Design a protein around this ligand. Structure first.
Ligand SMILES: CCc1cc(-n2c(=O)[nH]c3ccccc32)c(O)cc1O
Length: 208
């Protein structure tokens, strides 16, 4: 059973802007996803200080970067707090409507696409490099779900019976054909060192 939803008009406009605007500095998508993972890991870390049982679904707090040249995918996995089905549907836990408004007003006032994360909609920068994005998530208070969108104004949500995660979020980027550099080990290492060198959680870059 797959449910299909329409993006609110402001998010469909944001996604169209990210896909159609000429902007060469696409590598910032990785910083934005690692930053979101770090925020999720901070939240489960803080919650676990008063309720240690919230770590029964996994004590390790980390981020994995998994390239797959055969599938042309780059996957970002974290063991953060995860998202409920309600959070996924409500713009993946972001203030996307007001955030898109503030980002649009900033772009007219001198800001560029790399500042997207300051408006809480950094997730959508995944569409700088991906034709399709799959978000697999498991929160302690809900079941495992898969969100998916190739943009075009709609997204889907389904239960995920594939590999149980325990807790956290998995972002699968189905890369555009001219964006395969983001599957190269030396290129990922370079971007992590440039933009995410001081993240408070281990970042493991998987090899093939
Ligand atoms: C949709 C953006 C995104 C969101 C999350 N995320 C969650 O899954 N829970 C979060 C709680 C606070 C902040 C971000 C969170 C993540 O772990 C990775 C991501 O790329």
């Amino acid at each position: 059973e797959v449910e299909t939803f329409a993006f609110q008009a402001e998010i469909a406009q944001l996604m169209s802007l990210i896909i159609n605007t000429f902007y060469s500095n696409k590598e910032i998508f990785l910083r934005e996803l690692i930053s979101n993972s770090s925020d999720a890991l901070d939240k489960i870390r803080y919650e676990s200080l008063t309720d240690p049982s919230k770590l029964d679904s996994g004590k390790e707090l980390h981020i994995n970067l998994i390239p797959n040249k055969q599938d042309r995918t780059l996957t970002i996995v974290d063991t953060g707090i995860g998202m409920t089905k309600a959070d996924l549907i409500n713009n993946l836990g972001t203030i996307a409507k007001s955030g898109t408004k503030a980002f649009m007003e900033a772009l007219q006032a001198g800001a560029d696409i790399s500042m997207i994360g300051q408006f809480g909609v950094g997730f959508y920068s995944a569409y700088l490099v991906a034709e399709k994005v799959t978000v697999i998530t498991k929160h302690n208070d809900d079941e495992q779900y898969a969100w998916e969108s190739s943009a075009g104004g709609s997204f889907t949500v389904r239960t995920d019976t594939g590999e149980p995660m325990g807790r956290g979020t998995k972002v699968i980027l189905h890369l555009k054909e001219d964006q395969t550099e983001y599957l190269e080990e030396r290129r990922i290492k370079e971007i992590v060192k440039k933009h995410s060198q001081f993240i408070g959680y281990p970042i493991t870059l998987f090899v093939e």
